[model samples]
Target: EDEVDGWLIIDMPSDRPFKQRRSFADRCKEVQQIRDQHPSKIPVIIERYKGEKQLPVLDKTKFLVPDHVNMSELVKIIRRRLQLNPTQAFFLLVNQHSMVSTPIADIYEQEKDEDGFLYMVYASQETFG
Candidate 1:
């Protein structure tokens, strides 16, 4: 691996250009560093049906959630914030389909909209299909 070498050219604001020799290991380390600094959180935009009421604490809108949190945990958080009773039931949908027990990170990576937000529809069981 150490036998090969390469050069990189970086353009500057001035009329001159900079050149440097770097190893593959150096580039890999730089990429890993960038990965480490990447955000582990995702934002979700919750939309309530026209007839449904909004939760005051969550404002029934946007939430910055940890990527590791699952859908069940997210639902629980919303239920708790809404001060809902056990008899009540809520449904969560993403892109018109129900959200299962998957991590927010995975869902966001696979289904996030162009706005970079996981658009979720929240409704009471009676209001949802």
Candidate 2:
């Protein structure tokens, strides 16, 4: 909670920190091995935003996404996966937020963690302007 990157983790459960769940070296190696097995895909992790009221937690946390996936396409999958109604709303934050057509592999490059997974969190709030 005290680190400068606290915002990156403020929405996570204290008992379930991803890094704490695995060794750093092991995580890096896991990513390295998975990448070799699926060269065209990128790893991603999308977790529930803390204090969430409307959005449901995703069924799986880790995803093997294709390199050409766009942010808009990802949201479509999440929308269907969540069984969300057309009137329902949520915000997926990569820290800047969206109505985006941004390529996810591009996002992966910019946001991947030391362990090589690109992480994101979604909430039913506007969060910031």
Candidate 3:
């Protein structure tokens, strides 16, 4: 796994990336079914930052986002999903790069994993500080 610059890391032998938990073929099937059911929605796999502490753990790791949504607005939606208010500030990474100002569907197609879902990791800055 990759660590951010100058950040502390955790040791979790049992913690694995989603890719390791399932086979590529199975995930490909999931994408097919999910896309057919809601072609407008893309499945996203969201996880807390590896070295995070300020925010509580997410109740569910998977989310469905419409292709039309903007990344800036998506950040707001995530804040609401997490019930965040004053302590609301986050950075969502598709992989290593943060996103904004582009057609999100393009973003999806670019980073869409070889399998079923798009992966996202969120880290806090303001609240955590």
Q: What is each predicted model's overall lDDT from 0 to 1?
A: 0.62, 0.76, 0.76
For model 3, what is the alpha-carbon lDDT of residue 61? 80
Order the numbered candidates by TM-score, best leading: 2, 3, 1
Q: Which residues of candidate 2, in runs, are more than 4 Å off? A: 1-15
**Model 1 lDDT per residue over 66-96, tens place:** 8899998988888788787767767677776
Name every residue pair that clashes in candidate 2.
none
Model 3 over residues 22-76: C-alpha lDDT tens digits?
Answer: 6799888988899999999878888887667777777788788888887877777
Candidate 3 Cα outliers beyond 4 Å, as residue runs: 2-15, 86-88, 125-129
Give the TM-score of each candidate: 0.61, 0.80, 0.77
Candidate topping TM-score: 2
lDDT of 1 at 115: 40
lDDT score for residue 94 of model 3: 80
